[PDB]
Structures are given as C-alpha cells and as structure tokens.
C-alpha cells in the first residue's frame, strides 16, 4: 500500500465507538431477503441495507435488543418463506398512517371515519402507485403479496394497526434446518405466535439445551384461575421450561428483544436474577391488582411500574423454577464440557494422550476445580462454608473412580463413567417484610434484670 500522509486522522461527530463475550439470540422471522436460513447482523442499519423495511418484525426485534443495558453486539435472524402479508385495522385511529413499504423503498400515505374506509383507501394508493405488487382490501384489512420473485417488505409507523405475516412452513419442520447451518446461538424467539407453533418450539429448545422466550397479548393470561384457555396453562401442564411474560405490544413491537437485551451479557456465574431489572421499551402492566394475582399463579410474568420507573417482577419459568437457576444449570453444563475437552486436546496434540490409570485420572480434580468451580466462588454464585443447623459443610466435592472399579466392558469402549460433583447455589433476595412501631409518650420503665439470659428451662425430664 501507499500512504500519502505520515499521520492520518479520522474525525467524526456524535459519539465515540462502543467488544465482550455474549450469547447471541436468534429470531425466526418470515421474509425472502436472502436464500440463506441464518445470518448475523451487528446493527439495525445493516438490516435495512439488506432490504428490510423499517418497522418490520425483524427490524423491531433488533432495535430493542441493542437498546438494553446488557445488550449483545450481534443478533441472528432466521428465515421462513412468506406466502402473503396483512395489515389489520380492527381498531380506531384518527391520524395519518405512514405505512412504510419497500420493493427490491417508498412510504405509502393514508388519511383519515371508519376502519373500512381507511383500509379501502390504502389499497387504492398501493395500486397505480409499481404494477408488480398485489394489494386488495377485504372488509377491515388489506392483503399485500408479491406477484413475482421480487422482495417486498411492509413496515410500520404513525398509525394504529399491526402487521401479520403468514407462511406455509411450520415451525416444527423449519428448526431442524436452521440449526444445520449454524449452532452459535442460545436464545430462541419466534415470530409465528400461534398456540401450536409456540409449543413446537418449546419442545425443540428443551431437547437442544436452548432457552425459549415469548411474549403474548392473550387476555386469558390474567383471567380467573379456573379458565385454562391460555397458552401459559398448556405449558405449565407439560412441565416445559420457557420464560413467558404478558405484554400488550407483544404483536406490535415484539418486545422479546427488550427481555433478551437484559440477559445477553449477564454471565450466570454471579447468580443475579431478572427481579427488578429495567426493560427499556415495554409498558407497565395495568390490570388492577387481582389480575396481577391471577397472572402470578399462571407463571406469566408482568412488567410493572413502581415509583416512576418500570420493574420486571420475578422470572419464574413455566414449570415454576426461577430463571436464574435454569441459566445456572446450563452454565454449569457448558463450562464443564469445554474445560475437560480442552484439557484432553492439549494432551492429545502433544502425543501424550491421556490414559486410564490411577496415576492420571486424579488430575481431573485440578481441572474441574480450576475453570468452572473457582470462577463461581469468586463471583459469589457458589456458596461455601458451614451450616449451623443441618451441621453440614457446603464445600464442593469431586469423586473419581479407580481403574480396579471400572467394568471390563468400559475399558474396551474407552469411556469413563460415574464422575460425581456437588455444588450449592446462592439465592438472591426478592421480598422483605418490616414491623415498625411508634411510641407516643413516656414508655414505662423496663425490667431491671441484669443477668445473662438462661437459654433453656431447667425442667425437661
């Protein structure tokens, strides 16, 4: 290369540039902007460059994810083939509808009356606007479809409505394909929010050690406990583990990104939870106070505002276990496989591969105690010490067998078994109670006893 200046200075305006370890989320959207089934993006501006329309479900998810306090710097997007799209006006609106729309980059304009008139008006402007896109109103909504293999993307803005994409590919069948291209993603979110589609993803994630998150606008979420007509009830019965929370914008803003934005960079080793964490973009729950009680029994978390701010209350999963415990279990699993695996490769590549004998097996205590266990203790996620009531110690234990104790069959297969480990989890604080008292005037003189208080009554036999 040739450099014309000995020193070169780039000067920009607005802010200085923001790299850490994080777990990427994956959002399974419906689009046709690339032939691949998974692609990584680092910013919203990258999405629109690929033909994504502003306000589209994929764009809304990404912008919320990057706005969190623990936001990741790289998101992943799935792909399902679009069959059509809808713009639904089953709701009153009294302002111009700036419906962004992109082919292969315009912004349709509407003016407002009744939903039927405005829906018809929009279809009129789509036609005679570009005779290669389909638009037809039907009662109270407009269906938009591409006539040819041409990328079409419908956005959002300045109006009161929702976009509902449709596809023929079921979630249960798409997921095995996307995981084939790449598996470097931890959180799983899905655009298709049908009752059956959500359950299918939950079963898949459980068997693949992924974490499933979903929002829902269902009114049955906080309905009376007897009415088991909500998706939350179905998951609870199946004993699945998924983090769901009721929110009114779940289908207009796709607030899953805000929830993920507060977990991506939060390493489980600290034992921190989602209690009282701030979600930047969700709206406080409004349903009275009894409605809050119904949701809690449903394991349907809510975003609640107190003292001027917003606070996420309890991250109970569908089965009832707290989320921070579930993330810890996955953290323990992943960081013990890598630690042991990484040690065997350092020995296999030196020619001195590890061998099954009593002079080599004991070394594992130094490996396991080093990477996974010691980090937890330093960060406070693992308890240690002594218990004064049960009279037991919390120190982690590691037991390794002996060559004489291994069946002859296992030596032929060259596989070790029955390594056992124990740990104690450290629980955060969620609720507190206080018993204050007030004295009005001159409380009576106290007892003058000045002896050490005897701790037990003499008579016990």
């Amino acid at each position: 290369e040739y450099q014309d200046k000995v020193v070169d200075v780039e000067v920009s305006l607005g802010t200085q540039p923001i790299t850490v370890g994080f777990e990427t989320p994956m959002f399974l959207a419906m689009h046709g902007n690339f032939p691949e089934r998974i692609r990584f993006y680092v910013s919203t501006a990258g999405m629109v460059a690929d033909g994504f329309a502003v306000g589209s479900p994929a764009y809304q998810f990404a912008t919320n994810a990057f706005a969190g306090n623990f936001a990741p710097q790289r998101v992943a997007i799935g792909r399902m083939s679009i069959d059509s799209s809808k713009v639904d006006f089953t709701g009153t609106t009294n302002t111009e509808q700036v419906v962004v729309n992109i082919t292969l980059v315009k912004a349709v304009k509407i003016n407002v009356n009744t939903p039927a008139q405005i829906a018809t008006a929009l279809a009129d402007a789509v036609t005679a606007d570009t005779g290669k896109a389909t638009a037809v109103a039907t009662g109270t909504y407009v269906t938009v479809t591409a006539v040819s293999p041409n990328v079409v993307s419908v956005g959002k803005g300045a109006g009161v409505y929702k976009i509902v994409n449709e596809s023929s590919e079921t979630v249960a069948t798409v997921l095995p394909s996307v995981i084939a291209e790449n598996h470097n993603w931890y959180f799983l979110a899905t655009e298709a929010r049908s009752d059956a589609d959500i359950v299918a993803a939950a079963e898949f994630a459980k068997a693949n050690y992924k974490l499933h998150i979903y929002n829902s606008t269902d009114v049955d979420a906080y309905a009376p406990e007897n009415s088991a007509a909500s998706v939350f009830d179905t998951l609870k019965s199946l004993s699945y583990d998924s983090l769901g929370t009721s929110d009114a914008g779940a289908d207009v803003d796709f607030t899953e990104g805000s929830v993920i934005g507060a977990m991506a960079a939060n390493d489980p080793s600290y034992g921190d939870s989602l209690h009282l964490k701030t979600m930047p973009g969700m709206v406080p729950f409004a349903g009275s106070d009894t409605q809050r009680s119904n949701a809690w029994s449903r394991n349907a978390n809510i975003y609640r505002g107190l003292y001027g701010g917003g606070s996420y209350i309890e991250g109970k999963t569908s089965s009832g276990q707290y989320v921070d415990v579930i993330r810890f279990s996955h953290w323990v699993k992943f960081r013990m496989e890598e630690s042991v695996f990484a040690y065997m490769k350092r020995r296999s590549d030196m020619g001195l591969s590890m061998k099954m004998s009593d002079e080599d097996l004991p070394v594992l205590k130094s490996v396991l105690m080093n990477n996974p266990i010691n980090i937890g203790i330093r960060n406070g996620g693992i308890l240690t010490g002594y218990d004064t009531e049960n009279k037991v110690s919390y120190d982690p234990t590691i037991i390794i067998p002996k060559r004489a104790n291994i069946p002859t069959n296992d030596l032929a297969a060259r596989i070790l078994r029955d390594v056992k480990v124990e740990l104690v989890y450290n629980n955060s604080l969620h609720y507190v109670k206080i018993r204050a008292s007030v004295v009005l005037d001159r409380p009576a003189g106290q007892s003058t006893n000045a002896q050490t208080p005897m701790s037990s009554s003499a008579v016990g036999v």
Binding site: I377, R378, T384, G385
Partner: protein, 154 residues
C-alpha cells in the same frame, strides 16, 4: 470463606515507566523508586461550638514527586544541564507522565524544585531529585470499571 488473589498479574517494578520531557528515565536506586505526595488537605472542616459543621474544597493541587537515582546515571547530568539552561533562559516547565503497572497513574506538567545533596563514601550513594507537579491527582485509567455512579446513597 477462602482467601482471594486480588490481581491476576504480579506487580512488576520495571513496568512503572517514568517519562520526563518525552524520554524514559533509567538508573533508579534501591528501596523506593517514586514517591508522590500532595501539599494540603483535600477538604477542610470548620467545626462549630453548637455542632453545625461546614466544609470547603481545596483549589490547590501542588505536589512534590521524589525521584531517587544512582550517582553513576547520566540523568543526573541531564538534570543539571537542564537546570542551568532553565536558569539562564527562563523556560522551566516540561511535561511529566508516570504509568503504573497495576496502580494509579499521573500526567501533568512538572519542574525541578530542589537539587539533592551529593555524598561520596565507601559505597555508591543515592541522590533524590525533588520534582514538583502542577496537579497531583492520581488517575485510575488503567483499571476497568464504572461503579462510581452505582455507589453513593447521598
């Protein structure tokens, strides 16, 4: 509770670089190497008879940095020549920057304040040049973390 190591990297005295005027200083003596002290207290307190107390913030940050060097280092001659030149011409201010290994740092403008005594004996002696600094605020630039906003229930 188990004892915890503070920093994953040992404190290496050779990583504490001293820069005066843009040149690295070499030839330090034994025991201590750099001593940085302020001149006055940061906050003064006016105690009252009844009990009311009020505080004031000091606006003076003058400090003295002590450099210890062996008699056989060329930097002694460098400092003597600089002293003579500053005396004859008049310009006496030069930049001073100190980079810590695992501690605080310092970056201000300094000057030569006092020359040290020169002793000659059986062993090689030590001379402590006294350098004054405009501001003596230590900076935690090397350490990563922003908890000052988090801390504070005032």
């Amino acid at each position: 509770n188990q004892s915890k190591i503070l920093t994953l990297q040992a404190y290496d005295p050779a990583k504490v670089l001293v820069f005066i005027g843009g040149q690295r200083v070499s030839g330090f003596a034994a025991d201590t190497k750099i001593v940085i002290t302020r001149n006055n207290d940061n906050i003064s307190v006016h105690a009252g008879v009844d009990g009311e107390i009020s505080n004031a913030l000091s606006r003076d940050n003058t400090g003295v940095m002590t450099l210890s060097l062996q008699n056989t280092a060329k930097w002694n001659g460098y400092l003597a020549q600089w002293q003579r030149q500053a005396n004859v011409t008049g310009l006496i201010y030069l930049p001073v920057q100190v980079e810590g290994s695992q501690g605080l740092s310092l970056n201000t403008i300094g000057w030569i304040q006092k020359q040290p005594d020169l002793s000659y004996g059986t062993e090689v002696g030590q001379m402590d040049w006294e350098i004054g600094v405009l501001d003596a605020w230590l900076s935690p630039d090397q350490i990563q973390g922003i908890a000052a906003g988090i801390t504070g229930l005032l």
